[PDB]
């Protein structure tokens, strides 16, 4: 086949460019941000995804910088990166070589939705548990994804391993520094962001994870809507009208407005009868108006809903064993070390 | 209250400006296009919606021109229109005074979706029937809405009358003249448009009406997806991979590509068991790959699914009588006069 060679720089390395060859090139994605290709490394023969975006060269790329700093089992790994050309002359293009992952949580959920089936609770636990773990890690670096949603959760069919991807909106949130309110994706945008808050924290990702969980249990997005107001009405229909204090926690500029008082809708009636009580409990501790009242990602991992995954005799529906879910490092537990008593079961510590 | 007076020009009139006063002003909508206010006419005391958009004055407004030409019982009426100012100095703003309508098909469908209920078949018929009638009318003028979706279908709670609104994307399609492919709304975009066709016809609105119908029967959008490709995959999962001929009908530039052959999914399995056979039949005649094979709006009105509405003893769940659904004019039947034999029942002709 047509072999392409370039001098790429390793992702997690001392910045030492090297020759890299690849073939079997084919477009597998295209957006306003750029085109995404699939390729096979001539060396290892492994499949990779090449995300090509337009770079000004005069400004550093935030995504690249964030990625080159990440190294976790639940985060898409950045193999190499390099510059080139392609669309419209006299312009530099940044190419991100990431590991290729077959499916996404979104596509799997879709299969079940049109199959009139509910995703087995076992998978909901496996996926949510890994999502929170990736969140505990990026947050430990003070990094906020700002775009958590099913489409950005890559999955390995066989291993059932989940990897967070798409860091094109990620940013390091410095306590005491403004930030754009119109961030994240529609259905998954925290209430504070819909109210135009500018001093939000990483807790907006936990809200997004809660919407994800709820969607997996419901079979469809829990808070649909075209505009922010629509979104907020969907949220209020479930959580009820927020109190003045909750409103103050989200955006004090709305404290004195007198919103109609709508009664909250019981989480039990929201989901189906056969919904695990622990799932509902976990959901209510994630989808909280007050951002500081939401569970931390590390705390969510310790929640009872994930007890089954801590069972020594747990197995995947396909017979295989569950991915490594207890290899927590010091950096991962930094936020709350004591939790290691629960996060790491006895049959793993020794 | 604070009374505002202006010299507005009547919508369906000989262009004779007059004084108009109104109060009870309050924002009820805001978008990238402009702000929408609600007001009460000092004269009749009737409620109206004022859509204020930015106008260059150097270019005629397509929406205004299209609206001033429309006059139907199933189309939002344009009361008056005038110019003024508001946001950012030295700029002219066009204000559209339209009749105010309380709800939308989207909001009603939403109520049922979170109530775990299915919208009563009677309403599905009433709404779909009126939607097609508004389509038969605008199409008779060679006008294509290009943005049919639940949110643009206004409803009167009591009368159950439906009015099509939002003509900000409407355009007169001249046979043999290019047009933007990225038109309509996501979930409701015809296949030809997703394939980037530029010579599409008004039949794209009929596809959108079919997605609307399917959503009302399903309880959720039938073809979800973030991008076009995602949309197309959802469509293919239901209708099956399109044949070369169907592909040629949509966009000949894709004739020779060899797409994997996926088996169609039976419409019976798509909806729930208790779904009226006539609804499913109507749906399959609307959601057709070949745009020329789709039923015309006037033909859809004659479909058997709407027989119940032609029953002399038909009534609304609230006891009231059904809106005027047989007052078809010559202009409305122009497309296919003979159909008047079915469209207008015996207990109405005389």
């Amino acid at each position: 086949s047509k072999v392409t060679t370039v001098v790429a720089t390793p992702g997690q390395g001392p910045d030492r460019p090297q020759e890299v060859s690849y073939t079997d090139t084919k477009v597998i994605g295209n957006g306003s941000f750029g085109v995404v290709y699939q390729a096979k490394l001539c060396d290892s023969g492994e499949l990779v995804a090449i995300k090509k975006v337009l770079q000004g060269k005069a400004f550093k790329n935030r995504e690249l910088q964030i990625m080159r700093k990440l190294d976790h089992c639940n985060i898409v790994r950045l193999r190499y990166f390099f510059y080139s050309s392609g669309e419209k002359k006299d312009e530099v293009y940044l190419n991100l070589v990431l590991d290729y992952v077959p499916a996404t949580v979104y596509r799997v959920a879709r299969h079940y939705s049109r199959a009139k089936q509910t995703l087995p609770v076992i998978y909901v636990k496996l996926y949510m548990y890994q999502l929170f773990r990736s969140l505990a890690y990026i947050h430990s670096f003070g990094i906020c994804h700002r775009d958590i949603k099913p489409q950005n959760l890559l999955l390995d069919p066989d291993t059932a391993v989940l990897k967070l991807c798409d860091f094109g909106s990620a940013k390091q949130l410095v306590r005491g520094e403004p930030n754009v309110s119109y961030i994240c994706s529609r259905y998954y945008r925290a209430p504070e962001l819909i109210f135009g808050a500018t001093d939000y924290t990483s807790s907006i990702d936990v809200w997004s994870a809660g919407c994800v969980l709820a969607e997996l249990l419901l079979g469809q997005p829990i808070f649909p809507g075209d505009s922010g107001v629509d979104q907020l009405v969907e949220i209020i229909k479930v959580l009820g009208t927020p109190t003045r204090e909750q409103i103050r926690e989200m955006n004090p500029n709305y404290t004195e407005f007198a919103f109609p008082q709508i009664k909250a809708h019981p989480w039990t009636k929201v989901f189906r009868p056969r919904t695990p009580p622990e799932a509902i409990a976990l959901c209510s501790r994630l989808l909280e108006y007050t951002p500081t009242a939401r569970l931390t990602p590390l705390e969510a991992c310790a929640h009872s809903f994930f007890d089954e995954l801590r069972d020594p005799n747990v197995k995947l529906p396909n017979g295989r064993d569950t991915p490594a879910l207890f290899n927590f490092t010091t950096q991962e537990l930094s936020s709350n070390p004591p939790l290691a008593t629960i996060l790491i079961p006895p049959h793993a510590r020794i | 209250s604070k009374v505002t007076t202006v010299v507005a020009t009547p919508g369906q009139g000989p262009d004779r400006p007059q004084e108009v006063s109104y109060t009870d002003t309050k924002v009820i909508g805001n978008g990238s296009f402009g702000v929408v206010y609600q007001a009460k006419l000092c004269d009749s005391g009737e409620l109206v919606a004022i859509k204020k958009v930015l106008q260059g004055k150097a270019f005629k407004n397509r929406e205004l021109q299209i609206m001033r030409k429309l006059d139907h019982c199933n189309i939002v009426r344009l009361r008056y229109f005038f110019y003024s100012s508001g946001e950012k100095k030295d700029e002219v703003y066009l204000n559209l005074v339209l009749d105010y309508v309380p709800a939308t098909v989207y909001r009603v469908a939403r109520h049922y979706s979170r109530a775990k209920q299915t919208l009563p078949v009677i309403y599905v018929k009433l709404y779909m029937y009126q939607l097609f009638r508004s389509l038969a009318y605008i199409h008779s003028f060679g006008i294509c809405h290009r943005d049919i979706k639940p949110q643009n279908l206004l409803l009167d709670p009591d009368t159950a009358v439906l009015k099509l609104c939002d003509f900000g994307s409407a355009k007169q399609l001249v046979r043999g003249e290019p047009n933007v492919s990225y038109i309509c709304s996501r979930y409701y975009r015809a296949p030809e448009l997703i394939f980037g066709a530029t010579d599409y016809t008004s039949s794209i609105d009929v596809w959108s009406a079919g997605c609307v119908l399917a959503e009302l029967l399903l309880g959720q959008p039938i073809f979800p997806g973030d991008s076009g490709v995602d949309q197309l995959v959802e469509i293919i999962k239901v209708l099956g991979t399109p044949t070369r001929e169907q592909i040629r009908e949509m966009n000949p530039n894709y004739t020779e590509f060899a797409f994997p052959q996926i088996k169609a999914h039976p419409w019976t399995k798509v909806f729930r068991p208790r779904t009226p056979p006539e609804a499913i039949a109507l749906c399959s005649r609307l959601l057709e790959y070949t745009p020329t094979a789709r039923l015309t709006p006037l033909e859809a009105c004659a479909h058997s699914f709407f027989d119940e509405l032609r029953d002399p003893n038909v009534k609304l769940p609230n006891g009231r009588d059904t809106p005027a659904l047989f007052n078809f004019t010559t202009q409305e039947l122009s497309s296919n006069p003979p159909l008047a034999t079915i469209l207008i029942p015996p207990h109405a002709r005389i």
């Binding site: 107001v229 | 924002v27 009820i28």
Partner: peptide, 18 residues
Amino acid sequence: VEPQKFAEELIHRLEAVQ
């Protein structure tokens, strides 16, 4: 002006639902 207008819209919508 932003809060005031956003609030008005939200209030209008909530009054309809409730």
